[PDB]
Amino acid sequence: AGILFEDIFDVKDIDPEGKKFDRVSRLHCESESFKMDLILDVNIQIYPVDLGDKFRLVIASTLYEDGTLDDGEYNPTDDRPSRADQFEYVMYGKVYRIEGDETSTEAATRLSAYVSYGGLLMRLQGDANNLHGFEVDSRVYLLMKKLA
Amino acid sequence: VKYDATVRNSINQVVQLRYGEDGLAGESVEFQNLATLKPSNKAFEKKFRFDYTNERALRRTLQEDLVKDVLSNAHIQNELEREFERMREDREVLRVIFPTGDSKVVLPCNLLRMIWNAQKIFHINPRLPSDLHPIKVVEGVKELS
Amino acid sequence: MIIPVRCFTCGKIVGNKWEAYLGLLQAEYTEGDALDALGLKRYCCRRMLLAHVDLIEKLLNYAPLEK
Amino acid sequence: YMHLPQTDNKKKIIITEDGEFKALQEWILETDGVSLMRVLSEKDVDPV
Amino acid sequence: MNAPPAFESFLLFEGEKKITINKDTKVPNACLFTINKEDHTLGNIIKSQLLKDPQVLFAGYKVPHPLEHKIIIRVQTTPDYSPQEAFTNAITDLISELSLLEERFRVAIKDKQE
Amino acid sequence: QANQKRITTPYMTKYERARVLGTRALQIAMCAPVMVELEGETDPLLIAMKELKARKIPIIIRRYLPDGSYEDWGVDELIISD
Amino acid sequence: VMGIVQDTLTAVRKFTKRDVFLERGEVMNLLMFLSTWDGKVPQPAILKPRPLWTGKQIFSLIIPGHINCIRTHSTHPDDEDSGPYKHISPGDTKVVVENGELIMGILCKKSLGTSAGSLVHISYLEMGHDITRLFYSNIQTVINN
Amino acid sequence: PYANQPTVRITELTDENVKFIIENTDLAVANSIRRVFIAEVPIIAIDWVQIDANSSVLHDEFIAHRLGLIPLTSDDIVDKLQYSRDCTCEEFCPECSVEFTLDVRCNEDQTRHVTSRDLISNSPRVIPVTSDDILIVKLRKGQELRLRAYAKKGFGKEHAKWNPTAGVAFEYDPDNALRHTVYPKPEEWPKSEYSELDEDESQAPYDPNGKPERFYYNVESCGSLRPETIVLSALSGLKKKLSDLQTQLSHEIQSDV
Numbered sequence A: 001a002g003i004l005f006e007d008i009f010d011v012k013d014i015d016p017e018g019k020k021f022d023r024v025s026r027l028h029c030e031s032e033s034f035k036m037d038l039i040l041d042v043n044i045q046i047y048p049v050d051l052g053d054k055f056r057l058v059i060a061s062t063l064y065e066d067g068t069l070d071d072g073e074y075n076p077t078d079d080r081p082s083r084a085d086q087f088e089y090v091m092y093g094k095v096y097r098i099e100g101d102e103t104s105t106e107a108a109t110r111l112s113a114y115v116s117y118g119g120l121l122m123r124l125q126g127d128a129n130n131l132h133g134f135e136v137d138s139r140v141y142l143l144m145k146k147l148a
Numbered sequence B: 001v002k003y004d005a006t007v008r009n010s011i012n013q014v015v016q017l018r019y020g021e022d023g024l025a026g027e028s029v030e031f032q033n034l035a036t037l038k039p040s041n042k043a044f045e046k047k048f049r050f051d052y053t054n055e056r057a058l059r060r061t062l063q064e065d066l067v068k069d070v071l072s073n074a075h076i077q078n079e080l081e082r083e084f085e086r087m088r089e090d091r092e093v094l095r096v097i098f099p100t101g102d103s104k105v106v107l108p109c110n111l112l113r114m115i116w117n118a119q120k121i122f123h124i125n126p127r128l129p130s131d132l133h134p135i136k137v138v139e140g141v142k143e144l145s
Numbered sequence C: 001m002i003i004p005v006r007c008f009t010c011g012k013i014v015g016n017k018w019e020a021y022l023g024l025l026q027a028e029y030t031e032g033d034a035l036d037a038l039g040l041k042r043y044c045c046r047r048m049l050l051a052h053v054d055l056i057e058k059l060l061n062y063a064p065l066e067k
Numbered sequence D: 001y002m003h004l005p006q007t008d009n010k011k012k013i014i015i016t017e018d019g020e021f022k023a024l025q026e027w028i029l030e031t032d033g034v035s036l037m038r039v040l041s042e043k044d045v046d047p048v
Numbered sequence E: 001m002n003a004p005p006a007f008e009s010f011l012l013f014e015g016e017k018k019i020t021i022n023k024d025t026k027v028p029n030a031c032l033f034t035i036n037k038e039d040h041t042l043g044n045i046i047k048s049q050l051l052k053d054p055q056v057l058f059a060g061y062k063v064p065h066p067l068e069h070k071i072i073i074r075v076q077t078t079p080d081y082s083p084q085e086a087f088t089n090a091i092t093d094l095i096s097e098l099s100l101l102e103e104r105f106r107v108a109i110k111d112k113q114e
Numbered sequence F: 001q002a003n004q005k006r007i008t009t010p011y012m013t014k015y016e017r018a019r020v021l022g023t024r025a026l027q028i029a030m031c032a033p034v035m036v037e038l039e040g041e042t043d044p045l046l047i048a049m050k051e052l053k054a055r056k057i058p059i060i061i062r063r064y065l066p067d068g069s070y071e072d073w074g075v076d077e078l079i080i081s082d
Numbered sequence G: 001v002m003g004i005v006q007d008t009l010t011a012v013r014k015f016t017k018r019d020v021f022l023e024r025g026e027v028m029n030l031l032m033f034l035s036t037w038d039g040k041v042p043q044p045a046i047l048k049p050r051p052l053w054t055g056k057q058i059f060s061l062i063i064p065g066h067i068n069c070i071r072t073h074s075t076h077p078d079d080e081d082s083g084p085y086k087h088i089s090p091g092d093t094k095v096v097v098e099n100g101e102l103i104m105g106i107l108c109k110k111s112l113g114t115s116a117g118s119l120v121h122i123s124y125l126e127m128g129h130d131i132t133r134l135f136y137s138n139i140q141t142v143i144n145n
Numbered sequence H: 001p002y003a004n005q006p007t008v009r010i011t012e013l014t015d016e017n018v019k020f021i022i023e024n025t026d027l028a029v030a031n032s033i034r035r036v037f038i039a040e041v042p043i044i045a046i047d048w049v050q051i052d053a054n055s056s057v058l059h060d061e062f063i064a065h066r067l068g069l070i071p072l073t074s075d076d077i078v079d080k081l082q083y084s085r086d087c088t089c090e091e092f093c094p095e096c097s098v099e100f101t102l103d104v105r106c107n108e109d110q111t112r113h114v115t116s117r118d119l120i121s122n123s124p125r126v127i128p129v130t131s132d133d134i135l136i137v138k139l140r141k142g143q144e145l146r147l148r149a150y151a152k153k154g155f156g157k158e159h160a161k162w163n164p165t166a167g168v169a170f171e172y173d174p175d176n177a178l179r180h181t182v183y184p185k186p187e188e189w190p191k192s193e194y195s196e197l198d199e200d201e202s203q204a205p206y207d208p209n210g211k212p213e214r215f216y217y218n219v220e221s222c223g224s225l226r227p228e229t230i231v232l233s234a235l236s237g238l239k240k241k242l243s244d245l246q247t248q249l250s251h252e253i254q255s256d257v
């Protein structure tokens, strides 16, 4: 239904290399179910975050949840198809590189996808059966919400 | 520069046969990298042989109707071995012309940039195998030059 | 030369305070208290009254060219 | 003057058995005044 | 010797109009206001009041040059609402805005004066 | 020379491009016929550039080889660098 | 030698960082000062809770056509390339421009200034000469404003 | 979609300074009201001066500039007199301008201070601010100054002598809450006059849903206009400018259709 990635993540590091930028912090995350680690850059003044915080992640091509493409234009008056708004933090960006672990004999025993949100970047090492939905030069969304 | 593309003086005395020993203007020339002078013999053979003994990487990089033609038709194999021998003698020529490993050298049009443009204009996928037969590349370079 | 009527930055009246500034300076007051007594809270007019040198007493020591 | 060069322009660069360029530090001599014609004719200098 | 007289910052001589309407062709439902002989004083008001309107997608202003006393305002709305009438609404509520502010300042002055 | 045995770079360079675009536009300025249809512009430079794009320029270029022998090229067989 | 200098460069540096974020009223006025803008507001990098535009999408709108370029920032850590996070760059170095879209990196003299292989150099060598002039004018308008 | 509901509160209404607070208003509206205070408030000031005899060491241009920047009271009749450009009157008339006559002669040993009190008008409702007096020129014995001056109507866009304010101060969001300024060391900055924090706190906490509001004004007149009628004149001028924009836009949209 347009969802490319479903997982629940947890944080352990807030800035291992230091507080490089004042309004952007570099999170380090990993899951508990299917074991993919994560790094991500999140704004802080519009979204507080701290250590030991659990959240679930949704990566979708479109927010319409109907399979119809949005083509990447800001339409604030097009809230009719009831976009994915129940989640309280939304990003938008594109991928730029999808590289894994190839020795030219087997086929991608692990995949690490790089996604750029206009400068805010993430990275997803994991099995290829969970990251095969990502295609190079494709527009994707990111969804965030808190968990109890 | 006269209309014979020969650098000449006022009283028609030849100074250069071609402008800058190659006949190319300096406005469009770019800083490039050869990436052939610096690698060793083992690295050069690893990166430019087009080996086909293992045959599985060649299946992963090309389509089935392409690997069927590559694994047969030994004229194609002889052509790629001739290309490898030509690149070996070119490596020798580059080593004789260029000492001290100065791989930085000015060339007209930046090859890696146009290859990246061709990648990101036609939306090709580096993960999937491509449909491009090696001798298409071979006689494309030969007919281009 | 002569005191300007207006402060260059804002435009507060300056020309009606030079005689008062000399009068308060003659009555044993410091520059800061004299400037505070003239209602110049902003420093832009404080520098206008403080840093202005008058040349008219030098120019009125000359005989006029007409009568 | 005697000094081992540090910049790669005056350093010994040769091909090796593996085809890799290797930086070799060799003793060089810098003089004052030019007498090259008798310098290359002398024993144990490189005429190249 | 090339100092312009100070009155051409807001006067209009014979030959130009106050308002000229250009229809943009890059995007549908767009207008190009070319309000002449005002400054950022009007343009900031226009931009803020049009951003207050929810059904206006694009409405911004810029000056081409600080010497030429000219501003240009480009307004783009939804495909059911003309930019010209959007400008008209953004001015006719602004008139009520300024009149209400004037009346409240008047009654504040009257209440403060005993 | 004849049609055969004619050697020079066939890319019409920027210098003769400027020279032709000047000369023909001055010919419009001295009321010469215009080789292309025009749609409401009066600058001779603009129409001369438009018909240089249209490659209908009615002059030929006599190129001086350094040997001394001339060599004539028209406009329509020269191709535009742009 | 045509190069951004003295004020616009050090403002591109502060406008290009990760930490800068523009509200709708800021991108709202920055899109007026363009000339080559297609007339479509791009999708913001932040949607919920409030729509925020980062400066890299704005400079992507500045970059015309499809330019591909990889430069390094001036304060590039030399240990980042050898170790991990080579394409992550926690210091946000390693400027990459992909398909006319600014992806990471803070621009500086080594990317927009009078340097060989700079962004304006590739813009001249790919798009042409008029488009480069519009590129320079759009930079000097939007970054100053 | 429509206009909001601003409120005004006045904290000080002395004879030369007015502080008022405007709430529930966008930033651009308050900025424009501040701009109109110092640029587009009508006032009567001297622009046309004619020198008959000037033996002073201060030559004609000094005296012309000083007389041009003398403030003139226009508390009631600034609306009545029209602009000289819009007057059907040729050159100048008493309905379109105010005539000033200055005549002074020093024949005493001590220095004669020619001040603004010596300026004589025709209409009693226009006078320089003497009801200390503004110095113009000092004269030695035997030096004369005879001139006639005309006072037009204009605002601050033409010249700074038509600027009615002394100096306007515009404060919004006093203790920093929206991070419109980023303080590198917040403890090194003094608290504002309208700040609402204790000594321990440096800045207000972050407000992501905030919007700039509760503007603080400290407008100050130069003694020409009353400091409370200048705001009314500015609002009236802005309203008339936008009414002119209404008329011009309506004419253009009926002309196009």
Ligand SMILES: [Zn+2]
Pocket (backbone or CB within 6 Å): C007, C008, C009, C010, C011, C012, C042, C044, C045
């Ligand atoms: Zn002042």
Ligand SMILES: [Zn+2]
Pocket (backbone or CB within 6 Å): H087, H088, H089, H090, H091, H092, H093, H094, H095, H096, H097
């Ligand atoms: Zn009159």
